[PDB]
Design a protein around this nucleic acid. Structure first.
Ligand code: K
Ligand code: K
Ligand code: MG
Ligand code: MG
Ligand code: MG
Ligand code: MG
Ligand code: MG
Ligand code: MG
Ligand code: MG
Ligand code: MG
Ligand code: MG
Ligand code: MG
Ligand code: MG
Ligand code: MG
Ligand code: MG
Ligand code: MG
Ligand code: MG
Ligand code: MG
Ligand code: MG
Ligand code: MG
Ligand code: MG
Ligand code: MG
Ligand code: MG
Ligand code: MG
Ligand code: MG
Ligand code: MG
Ligand code: MG
Ligand code: MG
Ligand code: MG
Ligand code: MG
Ligand code: MG
Ligand code: MG
Ligand code: MG
Ligand code: MG
Ligand code: MG
Ligand code: MG
Ligand code: MG
Ligand code: MG
Ligand code: MG
Ligand code: MG
Ligand code: MG
Ligand code: MG
Ligand code: MG
Ligand code: MG
Ligand code: MG
Ligand code: MG
Ligand code: MG
Ligand code: MG
Ligand code: MG
Ligand code: NA
Ligand code: NA
Ligand code: NA
Ligand code: NA
Ligand code: NA
Lengths: 51, 88, 255
RNA sequence: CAGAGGUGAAAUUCUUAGACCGCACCAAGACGAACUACAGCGAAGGCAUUCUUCAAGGAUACCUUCCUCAAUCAAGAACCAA
RNA sequence: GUGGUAAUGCGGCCAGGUAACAAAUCAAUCCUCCCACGGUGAGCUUUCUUUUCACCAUAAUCCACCUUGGGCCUUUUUACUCUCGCGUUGUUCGGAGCGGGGGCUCAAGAUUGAAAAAUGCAUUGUGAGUUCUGCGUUAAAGCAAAAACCUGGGGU
RNA sequence: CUGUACUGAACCAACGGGAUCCGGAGUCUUGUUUCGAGACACUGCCAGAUGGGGAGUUUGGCUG
RNA sequence: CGGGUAAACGGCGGGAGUAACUAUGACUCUCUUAAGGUAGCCAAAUGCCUCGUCUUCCAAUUAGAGACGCGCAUGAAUGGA
RNA sequence: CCAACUGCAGACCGUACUCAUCACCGCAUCAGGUCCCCAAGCAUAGAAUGCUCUGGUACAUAGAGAAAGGUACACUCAGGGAAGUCGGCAAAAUAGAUGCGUAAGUUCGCAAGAAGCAUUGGCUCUGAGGGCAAAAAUUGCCAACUCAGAACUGCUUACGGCGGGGAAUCCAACUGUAUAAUUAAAACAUAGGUUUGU
RNA sequence: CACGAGUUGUUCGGAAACUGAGCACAACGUUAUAUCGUUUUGUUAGGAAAGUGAAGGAACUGAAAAGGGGCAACAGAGAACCUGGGAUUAUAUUCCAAAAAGAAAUUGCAUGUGGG
RNA sequence: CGGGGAAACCCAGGUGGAGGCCUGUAGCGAUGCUGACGUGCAAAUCGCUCGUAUGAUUUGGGUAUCGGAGCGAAAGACUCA
């Protein structure tokens, strides 16, 4: 949660992504911090391709 | 994952009081711990405190009704009867 | 022999009401002049539970009729009474749940509770959770109202007796199995010292007519006369009948 | 006021502590006769007093809309007299 | 009496409030223990040992005023348009007003100083315990009261 | 008999007349505080039945 | 006197014949009660006879278990299973 | 007028000591009983248990000292393994943690730690699990322990503490209660069921 | 065992001064007999149980206010003090003497300064 | 929260901490040894073993109910050996 908060404050992810990852973090989707970061990077890569 | 097959909230009792007493108790147990619709304020926020005492989290109304549900059907029938009789 | 338990309880002693946390007697308003000739308007300030009682109680605030002061009434709350509700009591009060009217002003077929057996009783009939009376008919000549009590008996009272419109709150309580001796313990904690119950045949013949024997048995019929003295009047007291009731359950009580 | 009931005939049963029968009522619970039909409605099971009320369903009418959205079935689901 | 759009700031009688209340969870105040560093004393020293042990303290009561959490005000309020957003470890919450910006307020602590070194004995950072406090489920069980005190509503 | 058909405030009247009373706030009392019963059902005495609830007492003798 | 009532106290039968060999007895006659022990269960913590009979358990079982029921004297909120 | 000083005055009773293997009750300085607060270090899950700094103590009649026979909060025992006994009484046995695995029956909750199988030392390392600051997916500094996996190297299987297990029958549903001082049970209670009076 | 000592408080505990489960004086009733009963479900008693804020010309008079007087907690409520001492043979948040080692808080009365 | 599902719903993994739930301290009891002792440490104790240990739990103080009586989850238990 502290990671997601910091990422939202620095504008690395938007509100929709923050909310989704927040509910998935509460649901035991990410095993550690690096797992969450890699998922964030994957989201950002797909977003760049779409853009 | 679903944690019990049939015993829902009654799983706190283990194997200890008979299936039928557990089941009849369970209907009312589930009713008395559920959130009930508040006709004032339009939310599902009525919770029973003590037997018959129902308090809404939303509008902070307290309502007397029902040992285990918010309104007994006898109450609804009586209310409709009283409305019809007053309108007579 | 020694004193039977049922006769020991009459001494009071350790068998009296556990009333320390009780809020006080629940009553209608005093049948004063304002209620006899007009109506009094009240506000439900709180719905509260009290130890030993299934039904909910309502604290209703009225203005004093003769002084600058507030009067707080403690009533047995009908189902549906909510905080902030206006309660009208009196001769001219409208027909609505929670309002208190004389029985002659209440239409036949109406469901009522907190019913005065005598005018000014402040309520003695249909007060347990879920209970109510049904108004059967009025006799405008004799000024008496006939009603059906929760027991099934029909009783007539003066039409000046007041009733609350509705049914007593807290209904449905006896439908949930208790399941545990501890739950019975907590249920009777707020009432009186009457539990657990020891069967008379499990006692010794010194303290109970059913006591003794080399088997547990009542050695004589358990139906006893209405004229039995205390200490002998145990078992099935002046029973008209015994055994499993087949077909229609007859209304209990006197004729 | 001396019987009533019931049967092929009886008896069990009720009855001068008044039964049966008679008139007007009272209460409670069922049921909705005749009209009632090779008639109507409903997927089936089913459904008959009146009035007030809720959502529906079908047919018909159409120079309305639309454009293949259908037919029928393991699995699964809902209803179902006594 | 008086200021602020406001939250709110400052100089007989009647009705509320404090007193005043079961549990768990998670953070925790002091305090206890440990570790790091640095002083002071002691111990061991055949041989090793930048070592081992002890100590390094700050009461009540006051003044001023850098966080955590709760309540609230004002302002933006196309905030929730078809995957709404915020937030807890945790059972949530929002047009009956979420979130953002800027404020008001309460409760716990910080920090500054007065006390206070004139006293005491021969030091300034972390990690674990710890319920003061903060966060305002069993129940057919819903978990005292009063004095005293506080504030208002009316009136002088 | 001034109000009605999901939380307000209301007290120590003003006001109007007569010389402080008066009314505002009606007056009256073969009188019961009010309501419901009612001369019965409640008090005492007398009488009958019932009455292990309880008290007192008894439950022979001879006897391979 | 006359009704009611057993989740009141309680109660809940025998002897005398019968089926192509033997049996035992669906059947029948009878004496009889307030009713004649139903569903179940059993040598059961309830069975005298009794260490009952059969099976199983052991090298050997007055023990244990599973059966059987002529049940001295099982059995339904005196609650049965 | 009364809100900051200032002046004077602040009465009564309790207060030693003890609170227990010697201060109370039990005839007594009695291995019994008696409410509350503060509560350290290491091992460890730990207020278990073992040892220890501070505080406390060496007070319980002692000395000498291998008779038999005892008692023990003391052990061991070849071969057999319940043949002992009314009866496995007593004793032995099992044991922590982790992974795997787990039958009949069942009120679907359990039965279950069913049953069973395996592994755990010591050393030297490797990996994973964070916080703060200025494709920040990087740049420095730093703290707390855990879990996993290797190589090497040992065992005399080695402190404490710590279930034996299975197949059935009778009874009671269960947790409770109960003959202080011979009976703890199948007895009582219980939820549930029924009846009676009103 | 003998002799001689030792317990220091505005603030600590109690009481002055709260209510609880309860108790039972008065009152009334009962009893041949009070040495009995009722006595908190807001509350005694057929029951007239209030004795004084004010004023008005220094203590004398008197409105309104319903339900007598007490007791029951040394763990509930309540309650203004806390460190240092080279200060004892033994007491200490109780003792310490003008540099009270000292630092406070809090009552009750009085005195001044000032007020708007 | 992930996966299936036309729908009703189903299959996972995490979170959370319910229970007159279990192992086990203190506490509260007292099963067995038919151990110790049995002119005792003791007019009921000691050791090991054992039941329970969030509840119908344990406990201080206060308070209420007694001898033809009280109280009793009932043993004729207890009411100062
Ligand atoms: K020796
Ligand atoms: K040895
Ligand atoms: Mg009482
Ligand atoms: Mg007995
Ligand atoms: Mg008897
Ligand atoms: Mg008997
Ligand atoms: Mg029996
Ligand atoms: Mg019996
Ligand atoms: Mg005839
Ligand atoms: Mg007639
Ligand atoms: Mg007839
Ligand atoms: Mg018709
Ligand atoms: Mg049917
Ligand atoms: Mg006798
Ligand atoms: Mg003789
Ligand atoms: Mg038979
Ligand atoms: Mg048999
Ligand atoms: Mg046998
Ligand atoms: Mg046998
Ligand atoms: Mg057998
Ligand atoms: Mg029967
Ligand atoms: Mg002392
Ligand atoms: Mg002590
Ligand atoms: Mg330890
Ligand atoms: Mg220990
Ligand atoms: Mg000693
Ligand atoms: Mg000795
Ligand atoms: Mg051997
Ligand atoms: Mg060997
Ligand atoms: Mg043998
Ligand atoms: Mg032998
Ligand atoms: Mg053994
Ligand atoms: Mg299985
Ligand atoms: Mg098993
Ligand atoms: Mg295992
Ligand atoms: Mg049992
Ligand atoms: Mg039993
Ligand atoms: Mg059973
Ligand atoms: Mg238990
Ligand atoms: Mg038990
Ligand atoms: Mg005994
Ligand atoms: Mg029993
Ligand atoms: Mg002496
Ligand atoms: Mg009292
Ligand atoms: Mg007192
Ligand atoms: Mg004090
Ligand atoms: Mg338990
Ligand atoms: Mg012995
Ligand atoms: Mg006996
Ligand atoms: Na008898
Ligand atoms: Na009258
Ligand atoms: Na008798
Ligand atoms: Na001792
Ligand atoms: Na274990």
């Amino acid at each position: 949660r502290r990671l997601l908060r910091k990422y939202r404050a620095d504008k690395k992810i938007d509100r929709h992504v923050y909310r989704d990852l927040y509910m998935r973090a509460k649901g035991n989707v990410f095993r550690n911090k690096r797992n969450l970061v890699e998922h964030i990077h994957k989201i950002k890569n797909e977003k760049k391709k779409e853009r | 994952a679903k944690r019990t097959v049939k015993m829902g909230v009654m799983g706190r009792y283990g194997t200890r009081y008979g299936a039928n007493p557990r089941k009849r108790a369970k209907k009312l147990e589930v009713s008395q711990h559920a959130k009930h619709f508040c006709s004032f304020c339009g939310k599902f926020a009525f919770r029973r405190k003590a037997v018959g005492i129902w308090r809404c989290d939303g509008c902070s109304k307290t309502v007397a009704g029902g040992a285990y549900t918010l309104s007994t059907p006898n109450n609804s029938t009586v209310r409709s009867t009283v409305r019809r009789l007053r309108e007579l | 022999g020694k004193t039977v338990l049922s006769c020991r309880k009459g001494n009071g002693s350790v068998y009296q009401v556990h009333g320390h946390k009780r809020l006080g007697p629940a009553k209608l308003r005093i049948l004063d002049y304002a209620e006899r000739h007009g109506y009094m308007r009240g506000v439900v300030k709180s719905i509260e539970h009290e130890a030993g009682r299934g039904a909910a109680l309502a604290r209703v605030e009225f203005r004093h009729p003769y002084k600058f002061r507030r009067v707080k009434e403690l009533m047995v709350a009908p189902e549906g009474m909510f905080t902030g509700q206006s309660v009208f009591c009196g001769q001219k009060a409208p027909l609505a749940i929670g309002n208190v009217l004389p029985l002659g002003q209440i239409t036949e077929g109406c469901i009522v509770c907190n019913v005065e057996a005598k005018p000014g009783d402040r309520g003695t009939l249909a007060r347990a959770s879920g209970d109510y009376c049904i108004i059967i008919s009025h006799n405008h000549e004799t000024g008496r109202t006939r009603l059906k009590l929760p027991s099934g008996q029909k009783k007539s009272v003066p039409s000046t007796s007041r009733a609350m419109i509705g049914i007593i709150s807290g209904g449905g309580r006896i439908e949930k199995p208790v399941l545990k001796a501890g739950n019975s313990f907590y249920r009777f904690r707020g009432k009186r010292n009457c539990w657990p119950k020891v069967r008379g045949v499990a006692r010794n013949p010194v303290e109970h007519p059913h006591g003794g024997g080399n088997h547990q048995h009542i050695g004589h019929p358990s139906t006893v006369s209405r004229h039995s003295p205390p200490g002998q009047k145990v078992g099935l007291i002046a029973a008209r009948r015994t055994g499993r009731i087949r077909g229609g359950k007859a209304v209990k009580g006197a004729w």
